[PDB]
Design a binder for this molecule. Structure first.
Ligand SMILES: NC(=O)C1=CN([C@@H]2O[C@H](COP(=O)(O)OP(=O)(O)OC[C@H]3O[C@@H](n4cnc5c(N)ncnc54)[C@H](O)[C@@H]3O)[C@@H](O)[C@H]2O)C=CC1
Ligand code: NA
Length: 398
């Protein structure tokens, strides 16, 4: 079978599994070439299979600390109709590389919202892994199940106080298109807060702390976004923004408890805009990211996931220099994105953007490549003419 990049309902149908291997290896190679940092030895990451969580895992394992890692993710493998998710394969190839380096890399392919999943991970930590010094909560989900009551909360990306309509980039068609987003009901706001707020992160932290799973002075981090006024309507001041503010509020509560009990700490890191599976489908995000890429590349300050994470750990969290938070106690990795000259240029380009000129004014090429790359496509050192053995791929284990 020769896997080709193709779309179904605006989603890539089949990832290229060996491309995913190459993309994991590219991030590992960046970390191996980096100056290096030291700090964490035993790391738990929820949402470890792709995007920021995968970069987090690769950073601590290969960027100097030689950390053992537990990854919890929800992914699916090959069926008789589907090849498996990018994250499915990322987990597998990360493990292969980590094992060769002599590192523990445990995968739990499980729903993190489950009480059952928490018990499994806690059991593994107590029995086998040893206490955790770093816990990263990097989860992006469309829904949350409350396993006790059977209730399902659905995450919706909607606006508040007024419908939205604005340009976006359709990767399937290489075109600018208008996307409509409607106002959320109070129930929809609450459900999104239930899924993408800090409740589950807080529950993980409490269960970990109280079952004696954290090392003294342990750190926990969750990831957030603030962005520019170009996206306040559909992000920061929409349903997802209300959820992220709940996440930031929970960080403060978790921080107080961890500090009191083990001298530990919790904080949100507000990261920069970039292409991941989750972000690629936020309305209008492709257009903002494409312009931002253009501006930041011209100013030599562009970063992808692995560069973001490597800088965060080596320059801010585990540095010689003391960590600096914003006035709300958040770590700011959007420090370069939200720089005044960057945002001025983004706003200026944005105002000149049309369906006819967007490829000239924005870095659509770079945006599309990063989108293709995370799905295993458009990568160097991958032979895209070679047939893949499906039986071989389906036998691979996380
Ligand atoms: N990509 C961006 O522009 C930015 C993303 N962030 C935040 O980074 C965090 C991670 O998102 P990305 O890396 O962008 O997305 P991603 O789609 O690459 O990663 C999502 C991860 O969450 C896991 N996951 C989803 N439901 C799960 C479940 N029920 N149980 C266990 N794992 C589950 C997936 O398996 C995957 O590992 C999110 O909180 C997002 O809001 C923050 C700033 C920017
Ligand atoms: Na992630």
């Amino acid at each position: 079978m020769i896997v080709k990049a193709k779309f179904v309902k605006g989603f890539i149908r089949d990832v290229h599994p060996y491309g995913c291997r190459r993309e994991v290896l590219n991030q590992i190679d960046y970390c191996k070439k980096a100056i290096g940092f030291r700090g964490p030895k035993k790391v738990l990451i929820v949402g470890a299979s792709s995007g920021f969580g995968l970069a987090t895992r690769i950073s601590v394992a290969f960027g100097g600390p030689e950390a053992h890692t537990i990854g919890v993710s929800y992914e699916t493998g090959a069926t008789d109709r589907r090849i498996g998710t990018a994250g499915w394969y990322n987990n597998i190839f990360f493990k292969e590389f980590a094992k060769k380096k002599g590192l523990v890399a445990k995968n739990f392919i499980e729903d993190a919202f489950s009480n059952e999943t928490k018990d499994k991970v806690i059991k593994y930590i107590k029995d086998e892994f040893g206490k955790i010094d770093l816990f990263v909560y990097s989860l992006a989900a469309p829904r949350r199940k409350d396993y006790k009551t059977g209730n399902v909360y659905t995450s919706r990306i909607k606006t508040i106080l007024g419908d939205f309509e604005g340009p976006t980039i359709d990767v399937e068609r290489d075109e600018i298109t208008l996307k409509k987003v409607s106002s959320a009901s109070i129930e929809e706001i609450e459900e999104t807060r239930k899924v993408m707020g800090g409740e589950d992160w807080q529950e993980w932290c409490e269960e970990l702390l109280y079952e004696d799973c954290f090392s003294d002075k342990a750190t926990t981090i969750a990831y957030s976004y603030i962005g520019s006024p170009r996206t306040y309507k559909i992000y920061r001041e929409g349903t997802i923004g209300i959820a992220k503010k709940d996440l930031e509020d929970k960080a403060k509560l978790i921080n107080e408890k961890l500090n009191r009990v083990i001298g530990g700490r919790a904080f949100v890191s507000v990261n920069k805009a970039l292409v991941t599976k989750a972000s690629a489908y936020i309305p209008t995000f492709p257009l903002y990211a494409a312009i931002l890429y253009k501006v930041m590349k011209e100013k030599n300050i562009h970063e992808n996931c692995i560069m973001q994470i490597e800088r965060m750990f080596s320059e801010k969290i585990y540095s010689n220099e003391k960590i600096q938070f914003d006035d709300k106690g958040r770590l700011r990795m959007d420090d370069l994105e939200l720089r005044k000259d960057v945002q001025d240029e983004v706003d200026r380009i944005w105002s000149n953007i049309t369906p006819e000129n967007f490829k000239e004014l924005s870095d659509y090429k770079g945006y599309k490549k990063e989108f293709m790359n995370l799905n295993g496509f458009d990568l160097d050192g991958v032979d895209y003419s070679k047939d893949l053995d499906i039986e071989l791929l389906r036998k691979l284990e996380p």
